[PDB]
Amino acid sequence: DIFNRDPRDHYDLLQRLGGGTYGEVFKARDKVSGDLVALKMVKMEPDDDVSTLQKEILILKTCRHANIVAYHGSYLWLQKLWICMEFCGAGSLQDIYQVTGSLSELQISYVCREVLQGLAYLHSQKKIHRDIKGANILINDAGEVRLADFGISAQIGAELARRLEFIGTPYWMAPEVAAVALKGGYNELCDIWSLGITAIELAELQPPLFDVHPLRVLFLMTKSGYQPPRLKEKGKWSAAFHNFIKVTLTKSPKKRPSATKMLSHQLVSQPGLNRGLILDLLDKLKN
Numbered sequence: 001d002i003f004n005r006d007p008r009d010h011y012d013l014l015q016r017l018g019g020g021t022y023g024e025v026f027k028a029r030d031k032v033s034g035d036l037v038a039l040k041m042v043k044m045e046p047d048d049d050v051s052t053l054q055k056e057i058l059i060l061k062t063c064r065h066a067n068i069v070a071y072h073g074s075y076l077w078l079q080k081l082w083i084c085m086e087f088c089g090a091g092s093l094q095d096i097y098q099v100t101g102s103l104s105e106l107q108i109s110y111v112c113r114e115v116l117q118g119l120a121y122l123h124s125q126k127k128i129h130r131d132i133k134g135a136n137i138l139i140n141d142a143g144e145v146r147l148a149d150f151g152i153s154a155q156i157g158a159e160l161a162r163r164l165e166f167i168g169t170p171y172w173m174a175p176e177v178a179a180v181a182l183k184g185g186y187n188e189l190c191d192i193w194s195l196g197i198t199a200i201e202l203a204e205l206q207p208p209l210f211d212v213h214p215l216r217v218l219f220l221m222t223k224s225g226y227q228p229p230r231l232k233e234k235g236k237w238s239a240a241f242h243n244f245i246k247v248t249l250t251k252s253p254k255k256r257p258s259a260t261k262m263l264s265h266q267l268v269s270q271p272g273l274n275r276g277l278i279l280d281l282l283d284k285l286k287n
């Protein structure tokens with residue numbers, strides 16, 4: 001499961017695709033089959049024992065869903081853990097909308113449906129993603145939608161910096177999560193709020209309040225009079241899209257709908273939602 005060897009023995013490392021608190025991602029080609037894969041390098045911390053690392057790799061191999069990037073295998077080499085995963089050729093939705101411009105209501109509807117399918121699966125496994133945003137939703141050349149990973153819960157490498165990263169960029173987090181280090185916890189419903197913000201992000205090219213200093217956003221969010229965000233242009237988006245934003249951005253998590261409940265919302269249960277919508281979006285990259 002975790003080969004004690006250099007992944008360069010089996011893979012030809014191509015260009016760097018990007019990275020962050022979750023590691024460094026490289027495009028790579030298998031030397032035998034010729035197939036393209038993604039290789040993520042996670043630097044191991046001084047307290048990352050291999051017994052806990054083994055439990056995590058077991059979770060990475062069993063936590064599987066069509067709307068989550070497939071895990072192929074891993075390598076432990078020179079204090080760096082390398083995870084091999086399916087290659088999503090078009091990159092993230094942020095990589096796409098920062099070329100194409102705003103997604104159509106139908107395109108956002110399909111992405112939100114596919115993400116909710118992945119979130120409903122993660123929540124059935126008692127996992128909370130806690131990292132839903134356009135940059136963490138990848139698209140393959142077939143227009144399929146996949147979450148890059150199952151979220152922040154992987155206890156590998158820079159887990160703490162990844163867990164706390166929202167403090168410097170809290171725009172996608174639910175108010176009960178933005179109430180960091182206060183007595184109230186949170187639950188899986190915070191992912192539903194993050195998906196509502198992601199839908200405004202795909203419509204507007206940035207989440208609400210993106211230009212406000214992160215510490216000011218945290219302050220505003222933990223106020224009793226905080227009004228959840230809304231789409232900026234009412235006379236472009238349908239009543240169904242406005243309502244989907246209204247219910248996903250419910251301030252109280254005790255009133256916010258589950259991922260399974262959201263899958264029957266009129267916006268994401270409408271006919272004609274399929275990968276063809278994203279194939280049309282990818283065609284705009286040529287122009």
Ligand SMILES: CNc1nc(Nc2ccc(N3CCOCC3)cc2)c(C(N)=O)nc1-c1cncc2c1ncn2C
Pocket residue numbers: 017018019022025038040069085086087088089090091092095135136138148149
């Ligand atoms: C940099 N991140 C990732 N890039 C990938 N591929 C990819 C492919 C193409 C581009 N381009 C092409 C040229 O135009 C710009 C866009 C960018 C990226 C992948 C993958 N599987 O293909 N995966 C991750 C990734 C993996 N784990 C966790 C992650 C990840 N992203 C966020 N989180 C939290």
